[PDB]
Amino acid sequence: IHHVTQNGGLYKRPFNEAFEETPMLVAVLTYVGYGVLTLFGYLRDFLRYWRIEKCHHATEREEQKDFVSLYQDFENFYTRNLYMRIRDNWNRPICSVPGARVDIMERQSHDYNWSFKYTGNIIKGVINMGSYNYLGFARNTGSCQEAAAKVLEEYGAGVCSTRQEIGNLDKHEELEELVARFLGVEAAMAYGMGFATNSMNIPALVGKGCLILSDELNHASLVLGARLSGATIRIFKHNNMQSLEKLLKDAIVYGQPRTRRPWKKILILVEGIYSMEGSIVRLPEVIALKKKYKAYLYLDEAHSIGALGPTGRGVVEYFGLDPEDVDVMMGTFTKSFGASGGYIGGKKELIDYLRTHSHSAVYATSLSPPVVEQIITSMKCIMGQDGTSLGKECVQQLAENTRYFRRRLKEMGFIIYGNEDSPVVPLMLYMPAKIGAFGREMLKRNIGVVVVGFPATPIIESRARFCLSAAHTKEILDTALKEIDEVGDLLQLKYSRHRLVP
């Protein structure tokens, strides 16, 4: 309707995004601060060899001085010289329900973050922009936290066996039937850990003789599940549909690496939303390529199920596509439902296969009944099933909040990554000493944010990540936008070469 591609991907509405490059002077200035820190790290290592006290940390026993050393000292070099200098903004403990405002325990340090001490005070009312609470279902008073209390009273905290022995209740049977109606598939299956839905079910689908095509920026669970299967792994550029086709065509003409026999099959692992990048997958082009080359698709929508689409169905609904064109769909319940666990949906022969040949079904214990009762209630709320318009209002509110926030920051003058419809907003702040300054200066102003540094991102790509929700009022959101300006002026974070105009 709107536009097509040479592949044949049909886009109904515009697909517009932006990844502006780092200005040259800022890049040149980042390396100065990354070299000055390294020089001093070497100096401090030398002093700590026989001259500095450094008695605040731990060592090996006296009886095991002649074993081979447990660690390789050069691996935890950045940990003890860089990360440790500004690690007072990464494990902040909270003491209340997390959403839209949280209470943080106040801690202080005297030997430069090597040890901490809780004074006894509490910072109340801190605006929360650090936890995934899309749609705002994380609360301690309402109708979803009302039924969990009933189930807990009669069932108990947790089960004590596996799904295949005696840990198969009727709650599990009641939830797996509802997830399939939500997604629009035939059958589903729920597990109990989002990280273990990938690393314990991918090795049940592929083995030696098969090929895996991974996106550059995949989650750790997706990468571990592939490493455990025994298949060959090949990585393509991020969201590049030319790299994927060039790497997909060259695998059907040349076969396996040494014997040069045809591959048994080919699997493609992508994600719905990339949380550190803020982008959305080009799904209509990935679907129009795996039908032309007969590959299988594996979608991981842990950051979009409930956060995209007119009725909160995810990226498949957001693009107007047919849910049955995807071989496996997997997701979590911990980013939009305020719960725990994960699911896989798809055909009926696939779920039938996985119920018998999955590592989790036979070795790992089942889900907790009070958590299943959370998911069942909030999923019914979203479907408009309860009777109120809470599900519709909360779905729409997040869209306007995202649009307003992302538009204001662009006029203000910052560099923002990603797609215009993405509820994750990464703010660019490149220099290594501004990582430690932004987190410290925002908490002095009652705002909670997360920051990310080098051995998680590229070298000059440090950023701050904002998460929006449907519980953020317009009066909270204005307060946050007003306080971000002051810190952006104070630390000089407005790098954009071409700023927006109202």
Binding site: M431, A433, A437
Partner: protein, 48 residues
């Protein structure tokens, strides 16, 4: 005029990543930064 002048030292501390070093490390760097420039004018005076 004090506040304004204090702001440039803060920006200098961030651009060079001394905002996150201890006081003694900071003094070790500020000492050899001023000496090199100091002996850079002396060599640009005798040979001029």
């Amino acid at each position: 005029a004090w506040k304004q002048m204090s702001w440039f030292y803060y920006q200098y501390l961030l651009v060079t990543a001394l905002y996150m070093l201890e006081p003694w490390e900071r003094t070790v760097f500020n000492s050899m930064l001023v000496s090199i420039v100091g002996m850079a004018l002396y060599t640009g005076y005798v040979f001029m």
